[PDB]
């Protein structure tokens, strides 16, 4: 009697926003990770990402700004452990050990999976094909690899990506010093996919804007495309499929760098008959990687 009023309110496509059955899980998890992210970005105590007593102060009230602020990952003492609040002894022991990071990334990864489900859900309710779901799976797999898979391979949640602008740069620099990601070819396919996606976006935009004259709607949609170029219809499948499989590749590239099968070290490729080593452009990269690797203790 009352349940059907709720099963009609949820499943209706005549709403402002479509709250599906995937939205039933998507809304409180992406609200909990959002409210804990705003709280732990503004006001959060310092967190030791190592197992020593020198903690990283990542929050806004402890002397940061928008660029340098972050939600610091969990401690090395925790590792791959599940750390909710009731597992801790106190609230201060939870906040000191990086518990907000685990809370935010678990509810975010649960809510983004139900965002993919809600996209497929509405599509099926609207009578559409399932591609949007598929294309959103490439940043979803890229976010799963950077928060879950690389901590599983390295064995600790401290090796996950921090939730800040400068923490992302620290993750990238430390990843290159450990793994040499720039010479890893699955990353190079990611750069080619992202560069080509921006290229085809600007090129496809410019070529349409210049060849579209008028388009109206009665409010039977009408469009008068100015046709005729100079000297099948799969442009949009290529437009989606270039950037997607490019981001997929670099997602499973860092998922293979999780298990330390990492990059390409052309270490002393060229030699001289006098037992002399002639450097190349790889030795300068490996010489820099030894810079950042030694500073990371």
């Amino acid at each position: 009697n009352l349940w059907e009023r709720f099963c009609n309110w949820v499943t209706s496509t005549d709403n402002r926003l479509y709250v599906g059955w995937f939205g039933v899980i998507m809304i409180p998890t992406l609200l909990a990770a959002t409210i804990c992210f705003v709280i732990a970005f503004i006001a959060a105590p310092p967190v030791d990402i190592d197992g020593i007593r020198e903690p990283v102060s990542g929050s806004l009230l402890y002397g940061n700004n928008i660029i340098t602020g972050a939600v610091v990952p969990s401690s090395n003492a925790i590792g791959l452990h599940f750390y909710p609040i009731w597992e801790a002894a106190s609230l201060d022991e939870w906040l000191y050990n990086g518990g907000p990071y685990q809370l935010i990334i678990f509810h975010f990864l649960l809510g983004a999976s139900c965002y993919m489900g809600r996209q497929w859900e509405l599509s099926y309710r609207l009578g559409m094909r399932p591609w949007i779901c598929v294309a959103y799976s490439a940043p979803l797999a890229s976010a799963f690899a950077v928060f879950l898979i690389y901590p599983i391979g390295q064995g600790s949640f401290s090796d996950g990506m921090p939730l800040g602008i400068s923490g992302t740069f620290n993750f990238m620099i430390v990843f290159q010093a450990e793994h040499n990601i720039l010479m890893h070819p699955f990353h190079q396919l990611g750069v080619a996919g992202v560069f080509g996606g921006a290229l085809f976006c600007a090129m496809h935009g410019s070529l349409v804007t210049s060849s579209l004259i008028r388009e109206t709607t009665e409010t039977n949609i009408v469009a008068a495309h100015g046709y005729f170029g100079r000297l099948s219809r799969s442009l949009h499948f290529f437009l989606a499929a270039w950037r997607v499989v490019g981001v997929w590749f670099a997602a499973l590239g860092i998922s293979t760098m999780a298990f330390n099968l990492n990059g390409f070290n052309f270490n002393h490729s060229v030699i001289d008959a006098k037992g002399n080593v002639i450097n190349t452009w790889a030795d300068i990269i490996n010489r820099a990687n030894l810079g950042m690797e030694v500073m990371h203790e």
């Binding site: 349940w3 059907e4 099963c7 059955w21 995937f22 039933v24 409180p28 909710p84 609040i85 009731w86």
Partner: peptide, 29 residues
């Protein structure tokens, strides 16, 4: 901590059971 533990457990069972129940039962009407 157990007052926040069984509270969170009640909400997670309440939402996953509602998701499973509404996905299957109640497809027409």
């Amino acid at each position: 901590m157990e007052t926040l533990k069984i509270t969170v457990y009640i909400v997670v069972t309440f939402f996953v059971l509602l998701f499973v129940f509404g996905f299957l039962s109640g497809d027409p009407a």
